[PDB]
Amino acid sequence: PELPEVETIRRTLLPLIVGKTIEDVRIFWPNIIRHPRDSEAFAARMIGQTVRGLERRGKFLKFLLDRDALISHLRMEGRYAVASALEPLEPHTHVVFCFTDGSELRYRDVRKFGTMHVYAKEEADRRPPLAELGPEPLSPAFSPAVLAERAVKTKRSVKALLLDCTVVAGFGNIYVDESLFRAGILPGRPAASLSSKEIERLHEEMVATIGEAVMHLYVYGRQGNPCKRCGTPIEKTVVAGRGTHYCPRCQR
DNA sequence: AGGTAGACCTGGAC
DNA sequence: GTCCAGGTCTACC
Ligand SMILES: [Zn+2]
């Protein structure tokens, strides 16, 4: 799930779990649990706590309990659902939080790439995975100034830059390729080669692109298809070790 | 010093 | 077999 989807999950999951108290935590794939390292400690510390809120930082959901925060990243396929403890579990359910009301928050992930970290609340923002997180892309803290400062300081591509969570929080691959196309900038361009005008323009498309989706694709996944703006076939290559799509005529 | 390219994970799809 | 994939996690200068 990408930032806008995580935001929808955050909004819709909260009312379904707020005020419930954890009676048990069952883990079927311990590797998902990254902190505490022992999945038995992770399970024991959460029992007895009540869910008080649910926030989002980048693509990370932050479950707020009485004493602890549970920080969860779903990666590509992770999913949460609330259902009855009386019903059989769906496939690929790796972690289940059982509440005292007979309902359960179930985490499913066919790829098992998702992660969970639990810490005393006041410690979460200063520990992994939230600690080096850059600013929300839709906040005033993510500014052209900030983006320029990071761009002129690295030898990496503009795409590698946008993909860096310390630069901006949770801006995924699809949004990076769509924003670069809307801004008219090739993804393989050295970040340091961008002009002020290009930076400002990239910043504005990033916000509109992800802003529109938080509330149809030009290039992502459209390779071999004609560009929606000019008809030239979209091209796909690998930049920053990821699938990268762009219009060769319109992006410079 | 620390910026940075590769590697790790995992299973379904080509 | 071979191929992705996010936010790490090494080594490597
Ligand atoms: Zn075009």
CSV table of N, CA and C in Angstrom, one decimal, chain A residues 6 16 26 45 62 68 84 91 102 104 110 115-116 133-134 170 173-174 176 181 194 197 206 209 225 231 236 239:
chain,number,residue,atom,x,y,z
A,6,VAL,N,-2.3,4.1,2.9
A,6,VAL,CA,-2.0,3.9,4.4
A,6,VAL,C,-2.8,5.0,5.1
A,16,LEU,N,-12.6,1.2,14.4
A,16,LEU,CA,-12.8,-0.2,14.6
A,16,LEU,C,-11.9,-0.8,15.7
A,26,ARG,N,-1.0,-13.2,19.2
A,26,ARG,CA,-0.5,-14.5,18.7
A,26,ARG,C,0.4,-14.2,17.4
A,45,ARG,N,4.3,-7.8,26.3
A,45,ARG,CA,4.2,-6.4,26.8
A,45,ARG,C,2.9,-5.7,26.3
A,62,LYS,N,1.2,4.1,13.2
A,62,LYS,CA,1.7,4.2,14.6
A,62,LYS,C,0.5,3.9,15.5
A,68,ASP,N,2.7,1.9,25.3
A,68,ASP,CA,3.5,1.7,24.1
A,68,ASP,C,2.9,2.2,22.8
A,84,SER,N,-14.1,-11.4,13.9
A,84,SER,CA,-14.4,-12.2,15.1
A,84,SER,C,-13.4,-13.3,15.4
A,91,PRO,N,-5.8,-17.0,4.9
A,91,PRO,CA,-4.4,-17.5,4.6
A,91,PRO,C,-3.5,-16.3,4.8
A,102,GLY,N,-13.7,-10.2,22.1
A,102,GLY,CA,-13.9,-11.3,21.2
A,102,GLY,C,-13.6,-11.0,19.8
A,104,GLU,N,-10.7,-9.2,16.9
A,104,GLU,CA,-9.2,-9.4,16.7
A,104,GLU,C,-8.8,-8.5,15.6
A,110,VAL,N,1.1,-11.7,2.3
A,110,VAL,CA,1.5,-12.9,1.6
A,110,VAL,C,3.1,-13.0,1.4
A,115,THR,N,6.9,-5.1,8.8
A,115,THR,CA,7.6,-5.1,10.0
A,115,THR,C,6.8,-4.5,11.1
A,116,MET,N,7.1,-4.9,12.4
A,116,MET,CA,6.5,-4.3,13.6
A,116,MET,C,7.6,-4.1,14.6
A,133,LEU,N,13.3,9.6,9.8
A,133,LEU,CA,12.3,9.9,8.8
A,133,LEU,C,12.2,11.3,8.4
A,134,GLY,N,12.1,11.6,7.1
A,134,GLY,CA,12.0,13.0,6.6
A,134,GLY,C,10.6,13.5,6.8
A,170,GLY,N,7.9,8.5,2.9
A,170,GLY,CA,7.0,7.6,2.2
A,170,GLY,C,6.5,7.9,0.8
A,173,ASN,N,7.5,4.8,-5.4
A,173,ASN,CA,8.0,4.6,-6.7
A,173,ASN,C,6.9,5.1,-7.8
A,174,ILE,N,5.7,4.8,-7.6
A,174,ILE,CA,4.7,5.2,-8.6
A,174,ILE,C,4.6,6.7,-8.5
A,176,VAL,N,6.9,8.8,-7.5
A,176,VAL,CA,8.1,9.5,-8.0
A,176,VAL,C,8.1,9.6,-9.5
A,181,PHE,N,7.5,12.9,-14.4
A,181,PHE,CA,6.8,13.1,-15.7
A,181,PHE,C,6.1,14.4,-15.7
A,194,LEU,N,19.7,19.6,-11.2
A,194,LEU,CA,18.5,20.4,-11.3
A,194,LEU,C,18.6,21.8,-11.0
A,197,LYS,N,14.5,26.4,-10.7
A,197,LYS,CA,13.2,26.4,-11.3
A,197,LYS,C,12.7,24.9,-11.4
A,206,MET,N,5.1,17.0,-7.0
A,206,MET,CA,5.1,16.0,-5.9
A,206,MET,C,3.9,16.2,-5.0
A,209,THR,N,0.6,15.7,-7.0
A,209,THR,CA,0.4,14.3,-7.3
A,209,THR,C,0.0,13.5,-6.0
A,225,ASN,N,3.2,1.8,-24.1
A,225,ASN,CA,2.0,2.4,-24.4
A,225,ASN,C,2.3,3.9,-24.8
A,231,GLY,N,1.8,11.0,-27.1
A,231,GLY,CA,1.7,9.9,-28.0
A,231,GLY,C,3.0,9.1,-28.2
A,236,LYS,N,10.7,2.1,-20.2
A,236,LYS,CA,11.0,1.6,-18.9
A,236,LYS,C,12.5,1.1,-18.8
A,239,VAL,N,16.4,2.6,-12.7
A,239,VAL,CA,17.2,3.7,-12.2
A,239,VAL,C,17.1,3.5,-10.6
